[PDB]
Design a protein around this ligand. Structure first.
Ligand SMILES: [Ca+2]
Ligand SMILES: [Ca+2]
Lengths: 150, 395, 250, 148
């Protein structure tokens, strides 16, 4: 069998990419976004990256979005809020990465460097997600809102 | 086919069955109404409303969101509460005028379950309250339009009357997309609405005993009545509250609710006796052999005062179609002269059963002015081949 | 019966697309339906000039005395060649999810979204629908010029089309002459003194759904070679609320 | 019926077969000026609050500029209001029998109509809107279709 793998940023340029899959879902999706790119978006923020245009039809219902508002860093996968965090905490000088793994085990977003502060735990890591194998996003490309050198 | 009918009657007894009705008619030698004795009706569904325990503090709206209502709003309900999926009646149903070349599909509501707007409320809601619920006494909280929050709500404790075998119910009106468990253990997806019991300590505070999921009769978006029997509550509970979660961000995953209430549950034979005119549909006309259908004498009909309906799927596919106004049914002079209401009704001991309903008829023009007319009967001696003209029967 | 049924259609539609003429053209380097279907690249060219005069607030589309027509007399969710329902559908177009208004009034004063990519700053509208009081509506537009007198052109421009919505009556193939309110096309002639006399009328070719935005067809073979100008005569005589019409210049 | 004090009272007669076999009306003319400068619905045959009232009834109206007499849903015999209520015509005959359906205005030159015989109105009562006690020219007569 011949395999195939899609990576992004292709050539050190943060340009959008289209690659519509016929099966509508990959096998595995691993994304590692540093916490030093949140402090570059405008205060209103936008899409750090995604697998569908933010204004497409049912893009949040079908795809995976990593949004940055004025108050939140959110990871939405098929209308399931995963690992929501307050903005200025990631903007603080303690965040290292954000790892958004999604495979047959489940969708799990990690906020390496951060620990929980509320929500019945207040003592564990910010690893948040769901062990559902049907939460794999629908891939059409990679669409960001950044620009310039990657 | 004999045991499935003997066991259904032996079990499930002294509850309702055709066998039980026939046995009662034989033992009473005739004077016994079949189904108008096992049905409990609630007239005036505004005296059984529950009242919050005095000495509590609330949020911005009132005693329906406890202290921190998040994403839940009084005007948080939709307007078109049509079902997410129609009924899709099966082919071959006897009393249905559906074309055999395509599936028969329709929608329906009871009286105003799914309506629009009305006067204001004690929370500022422009929502129409069904079942005759007064808006000046009935707050509302909803969660429509919050597609980016996934937010919850919790209510304040509502007191409970003393235990009595004639008020075995606590009732809520939701009109949402709630998760519930059927009797056979199955489930409908929906969203989370529950209810907590509790013991309000006189020389102390509340207890928060246990949580309970609702039981209903149909999967729909319009207004309804979720039920919590008092046989589920411990013998020492005295207060109740409401808990809502709504964690889904989809567009059509929301719900609303209303303060709970304990009905009064008068039977269905004392309510409407054997003299009041009643419109009984084609399916429910054999189970009420003591009610008087409205009479037609000289081409004019007398107007009914109540309407007895079969279950929802039977109604919307046979009763609203067979008796249409375009087909000559009794709706010709009913849609033009009378408006409908709804009465909340229950079987005596089967809280999981979707039996039909009862509606009240209100005249568009009162009867003080516009009274009934005189007919001035006469007679002629027509022959056997006259046929003066045809009947206007083409709508 | 089968042989005659399939041999009659070949003779009736000729020289347009039939299932046995395409198989014969395929030998001489021919396509299928791709040779007999005509598409409008830009559906904004070909609007006729109204002869000068004095009109009211509806522009030249509404003539001297429009009775019951208003520019924004259209319901909310009216789309091109479809019927917008409540819950979404799989293969919808872009205009299913769009603002009900336009936020800018057109050249007519209306705020209705126009189909086929028609610029609201050039294409007026007029409608009969109302929500307060029903009425009998009439309309007779100005005289719209016809292009020229040449057959080389008519070999390539064999149509006069009107974008309309409502409950129009017209001629179809699947269901001939479905009744309803009327939108027709009057054509005029000249005279030795110099004037435009009303003499003639053409009925449309409806193919689209009932309440949608669609195209009414008038082949230029019905209109004679002495016709000088063209105008729209619309009439809605039903007092029901779900019986309305709406038109646009030819 | 003498009405409340001296006026005329409405009626209710839910015909089972829908349309009658004779619907003579014969309404006067000068007894229309009582309408409040924008006439209501003088002598409907279905209540104004029904589901489809105008879609099945008779519905004489005044409209404050033109008085007209509708039918199932179509218009017959429009007439100007200032010409009518001034006293030009006498009666507003609305005979709606079988093999005849019209709305004659009886005095205005070209304010008379005629409809196909399948435009018969559905009768469920007599619902006027005037406050006129009793005229010699104000009548109504409905024949119920009792053939079975
Ligand atoms: Ca929601
Ligand atoms: Ca109209």
């Amino acid at each position: 069998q011949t395999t195939a793998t899609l990576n992004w940023p292709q050539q050190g340029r943060l340009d959008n990419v289209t690659a519509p899959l016929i099966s509508q879902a990959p096998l595995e999706l691993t994304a590692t976004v540093p916490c030093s790119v949140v402090r570059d978006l405008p205060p209103e923020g936008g899409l750090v990256f995604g697998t569908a245009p933010a204004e497409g039809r049912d893009a949040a219902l079908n795809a995976m979005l990593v949004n940055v508002t004025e108050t939140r860093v959110d990871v939405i996968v098929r209308n399931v809020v995963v690992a929501s965090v307050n903005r200025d905490r990631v903007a603080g000088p303690d965040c290292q990465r954000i790892e958004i793994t999604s495979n047959l085990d489940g969708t799990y977003a990690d906020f390496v460097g951060l620990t929980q502060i509320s929500g019945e735990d207040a003592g564990k890591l910010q690893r948040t997600g769901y062990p559902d194998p049907n939460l794999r996003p629908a891939i059409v490309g990679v669409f960001t809102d950044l620009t310039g050198p990657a | 086919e004999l045991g499935s009918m003997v066991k259904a009657t032996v079990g499930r007894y002294p509850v309702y069955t055709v066998g039980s009705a026939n046995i009662a008619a034989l033992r009473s030698a005739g004077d016994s109404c079949a189904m108008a004795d096992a049905v409990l009706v609630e007239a005036d569904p505004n005296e059984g409303m529950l009242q919050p325990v005095p000495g509590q503090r609330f949020g911005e709206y009132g005693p329906l969101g406890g202290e921190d209502p998040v994403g839940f709003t009084p005007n948080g309900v939709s307007d078109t509460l049509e079902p997410a999926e129609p009924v899709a009646a099966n082919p071959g149903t006897p009393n249905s005028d559906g074309p055999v070349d395509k599936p028969n599909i329709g929608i329906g509501y009871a009286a105003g379950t799914g309506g629009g707007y009305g006067p204001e409320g004690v929370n500022g809601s422009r929502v129409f309250l069904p079942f005759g619920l007064d808006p000046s006494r009935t707050p509302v909280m909803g969660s429509y339009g919050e597609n980016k929050l996934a937010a919850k709500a919790t209510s304040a404790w509502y007191q409970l009357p003393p235990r009595t075998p004639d008020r075995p119910l606590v009732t809520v009106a939701a009109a949402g997309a709630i998760w519930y468990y059927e009797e056979d253990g199955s489930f409908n997806y929906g969203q989370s609405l529950k209810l907590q019991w509790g013991v309000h300590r006189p020389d102390g505070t509340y207890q928060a005993l246990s949580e309970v999921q609702p039981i209903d009769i149909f999967q729909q978006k319009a207004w309804r009545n979720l039920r919590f029997p008092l046989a589920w509550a411990p013998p020492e509970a005295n207060v109740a509250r409401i808990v809502a979660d709504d964690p889904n961000l989809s567009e059509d995953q929301w719900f609303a609710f209303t303060p709970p209430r304990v009905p009064v549950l008068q039977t269905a034979q004392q309510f409407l006796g054997s003299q009041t005119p009643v419109l009984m549909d084609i399916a429910t006309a054999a189970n009420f052999p003591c009610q008087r259908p409205f009479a037609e004498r000289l081409g004019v009909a007398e107007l009914p005062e109540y309407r007895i309906i079969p279950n929802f799927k039977q109604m919307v596919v046979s009763s609203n179609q067979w008796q249409s106004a375009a087909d000559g049914g009794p709706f010709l002079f009913i849609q033009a002269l009378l408006r409908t209401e709804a009465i909340p009704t229950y079987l005596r001991d089967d809280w999981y059963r979707d039996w039909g309903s009862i509606e009240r008829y209100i005249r568009v023009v009162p009867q003080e002015q516009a009274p009934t007319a005189a007919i001035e009967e006469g007679s002629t001696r027509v022959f056997g081949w006259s046929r003066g003209g045809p009947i206007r029967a083409l709508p | 019966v089968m042989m005659a049924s399939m041999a009659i259609g070949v003779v009736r539609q000729y020289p347009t697309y039939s299932n046995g003429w395409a198989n014969i053209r395929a030998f001489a380097g021919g396509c299928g339906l791709a040779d007999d279907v005509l598409v409008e690249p830009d559906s904004n060219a070909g609007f006729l000039t109204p002869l000068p005069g004095a009109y009211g607030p509806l522009g030249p589309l509404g003539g001297e005395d429009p009775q019951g027509f208003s520019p924004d007399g259209v319901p909310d969710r009216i789309i091109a060649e479809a019927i917008r329902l409540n819950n979404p559908q799989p293969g919808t177009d872009y205009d299913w999810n769009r603002p009900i208004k336009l936020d800018e009034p057109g050249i007519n004063g209306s705020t209705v979204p126009l189909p086929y990519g028609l610029d609201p700053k050039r294409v007026p509208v007029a409608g009969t629908y109302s929500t307060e009081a029903q009425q009998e509506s009439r309309l007779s537009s100005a005289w719209y010029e016809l292009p020229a007198r040449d057959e080389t052109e008519r070999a390539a421009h064999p149509l006069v089309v009107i974008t309309a919505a409502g409950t129009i009556t017209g001629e179809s193939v699947a269901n001939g002459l479905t009744t309803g309110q009327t939108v027709d096309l009057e054509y005029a002639t000249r005279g030795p003194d110099g004037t435009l006399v009303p003499a003639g009328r053409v009925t449309p070719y409806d193919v689209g759904p009932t309440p949608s935005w669609r195209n009414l067809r008038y082949p230029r073979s019905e209109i004679p070679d002495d016709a000088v100008a063209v105008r729209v005569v619309a009439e809605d005589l039903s007092l029901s609320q779900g019986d309305w019409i709406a038109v646009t210049p030819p | 019926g003498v009405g409340a004090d001296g006026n005329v009272t409405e009626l209710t007669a839910p015909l089972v077969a829908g349309a009658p076999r004779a619907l003579d009306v014969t309404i006067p003319c000068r007894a229309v000026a009582e309408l409040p400068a924008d006439g209501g619905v003088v002598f409907s045959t279905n209540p104004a609050g029904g589901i489809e009232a105008g879609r099945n009834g008779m519905f004489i109206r005044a409209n404050a500029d033109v008085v007209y007499v509708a039918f199932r849903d179509t218009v017959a015999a429009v007439a100007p209001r200032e010409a009518v209520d001034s006293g030009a015509c006498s009666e507003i005959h609305v005979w709606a029998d079988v093999s005849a359906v019209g709305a004659d205005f009886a005095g205005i030159p070209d304010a008379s109509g005629t409809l196909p015989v399948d435009k018969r109105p559905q009768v469920s009562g007599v619902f006027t809107d005037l406050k006129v006690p009793a005229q010699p020219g104000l009548a109504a007569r409905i024949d119920i279709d009792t053939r079975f």
